[PDB]
Subunit: 282 residues, 3 copies
């Protein structure tokens, strides 16, 4: 790990003295969900590039900012553009923000992302709550906590079986009910793979057999660091496509479809998240 | 990644100006298949060591060369001796050649290798066409594309479900028919594991349950980079041994058997590949 | 790998000339099993920190020593405190000792550890003999042998299907019989995951489906290097807890329970190991 405890500290204090805002909830916007930033009131923007110690967003479009503000009553801090392992970032960089949030006083982390559907029940457009995850990179050593543990953040061997707040998932199925929507709110297990290339049919079948419902290339690391911090964690995935699971189909997963689906489900997610805010304690 | 775009460029241009040859098809010879180099006509040899930016073949025998020439009508470039992850090479070195070939004008990549049989149907000597692969190293981060993407080579999120040219596999089952052989031409999924040590019984059973038919320690990376380049990809494995899947057997996988099997299936593979050449478009 | 052959040599010779002891059996004490060091007679202690080239035990408690002596007749060398991948150590450091032992003249390696129970048959307190292992980190590249092979230690492609000495496991089931205990001596497959965080329910289910019986974050690397050396290998796990495999349970794996269980099974393991010593040939 390239960061010493002071680095997280100095980044937090810098932000703390450059904004009057004091967030309680940190929200990480996945692919094609960055719109959530518009609904914040008294919004103060910070380009990642100007924040001390932040991973310099190489070239995904150079768009990477930390937006502070109020979202339906709660003091939020949003990450528009997140860091992925496939871009070359070691996991201690990918999750650097999460530890900064903790030192800012945040106690809740909402993670969202796009993901391919492994469960045949799911359909494009669907929203899947994350009940659990399978951290494939983690089994091999790519775990954000690898390296000496710092007591100031958490214990050496944190547990993950209760990573996704049982309360928030219930208060979420409620919100969806109140919202009264056609499709029911899905719920399942998210499996993380490093990417960046898409899975093959044989790989899709492996992920299904392992019991995964959706597949992505992020989230799990942030969740692990969050939990190690004591943060409350809630998250969901937007099924932007159904992974090819048979050799006959002449269809291929592509970033166009993923962003396209993110486009149509845009406001649908903004509402859900915005309303869900009120359901977060304090 | 230690290579900048110019490095691939300079390596290509160097070769381009040191040989009159202009290959269309690149062939990577797996273990005990290097013989394919004899059948090239107007053969021009280059030791890896003399090619700018090529991974310096540490000590597997110091035998590593790029042979250009004509193989049954087609302008070929062959790699005699390939780089493996288990030798310590990062994947961006292992696959460095593939990107060089692309800049040389190659549009087709033929990959061959030796592999242990997971499918009980298979028998030593058998040849298995690769319909698909399971990239275990890739799930954890060991993907040759990890790092910033270069638009000049391909897209950020390339798809792999159609990696193995459906046309060539058919034109290959044909060639085998024409060849009229005892054993039928096998076809299946290749799973890559890093090695270098051989799998245990419990590991063999895992790989079988995942739906793999053959197991090796290479290929997948080159295939991924090839596809990311737009190259056409065809490949097969020579089942040199049947992996131990029960605790009673007092047999052990060994490099002697693997090379021995490669020895007997020698000319059988040279024919197949040589004839298959004519089946490649242009 | 940061070590050259001379480094292993110089470390061995240093020890060889600083102790009159000449061990035959090397014993690696897992979590809460370090007590085995008390039963050695003519015990000579060496702090890791004073041994040339040894990984400097960062901050797990600064307790890391190599204890030489006699254990029930045999010349032993014990490692009290072992190196884990999750602490940040590359595998060639984690397994550095094993190669040192080989050069000291050791021909047998006994590895012990604590592990969560995946097999429902098992219960806390149980002792599971290791018949086989599933090296998940190894499938992705985290294999201690990665890098150029040194003929002086072993072959390039060592086999692992016969890693756990069939003879010693039998002579062990015997010893347990003689010992006449309530619970029968368990036996099974150990799956290694990198950690340091504990598995989720979805991950537990994956590990069960793969056929694993117990789960830990160590051992496999040392075993692989041992075997590559020609060493005889025997090992077992102390089931310190049953991994959570259903979402209803409001229980969580924790280092307190693990050490607690290690505490009660303390002397039970010391006896077993001590007596087992006589069953090791010479
Ligand atoms: O089919 C899929 N496989 C793996 N990840 C994704 C995702 C998630 N994100 C989306 C994004 C690519 O379009 C990249 O960062 C991965 C959507 N669909 C799939
Ligand atoms: O049983 C097996 N397991 C994993 N790989 C192979 C291979 C393939 N190559 C062959 C070569 C070792 O003999 C090494 O580079 C791996 C043949 N048989 C097996
Ligand atoms: O449930 C489990 N999952 C993974 N490893 C262990 C272990 C083994 N060791 C024990 C130790 C943590 O308490 C750490 O180094 C892992 C015991 N229980 C479990």
């Amino acid at each position: 790990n390239g960061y010493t405890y002071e680095d997280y500290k100095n980044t937090a204090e810098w932000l703390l003295s450059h904004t009057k805002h004091r967030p309680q909830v940190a929200i990480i916007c996945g692919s094609g969900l960055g719109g959530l930033t518009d609904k914040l009131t008294q919004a103060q923007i910070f380009d990642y590039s100007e924040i001390p110690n932040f991973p310099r967003s190489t070239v995904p479009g150079h768009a990477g900012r930390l937006v502070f503000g109020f979202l339906n009553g709660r003091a939020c801090v949003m990450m528009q553009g997140r860091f992925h392992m496939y871009e070359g970032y070691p996991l201690w960089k990918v999750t650097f923000p999460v530890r900064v949030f903790h030192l800012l006083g945040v106690d809740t982390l909402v993670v969202t992302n796009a993901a391919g559907g492994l469960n045949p029940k799911f359909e494009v457009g669907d929203i899947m709550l994350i009940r659990d995850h399978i951290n494939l990179p983690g089994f091999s050593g790519q775990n954000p906590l690898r390296g000496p543990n710092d007591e100031r953040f958490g214990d050496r061997f944190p547990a993950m079986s209760d990573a996704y707040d049982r309360t928030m998932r219930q208060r979420a199925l409620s919100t969806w009910k109140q919202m009264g929507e056609q499709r029911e709110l899905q719920e399942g297990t998210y499996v993380m793979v490093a990417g960046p290339s898409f899975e093959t049919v044989a790989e899709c079948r492996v992920l299904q057999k392992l019991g995964a419902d959706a597949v992505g290339m992020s989230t799990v690391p942030e969740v692990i660091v969050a939990r190690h911090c004591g943060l409350r964690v809630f998250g969901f995935s937007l099924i932007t496509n159904k992974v090819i699971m048979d050799y006959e189909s002449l269809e291929k997963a592509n970033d166009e479809e993923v962003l396209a689906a993110g486009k149509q489900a845009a406001q649908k997610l903004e509402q859900f998240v915005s309303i869900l805010m009120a359901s977060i304690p304090l």
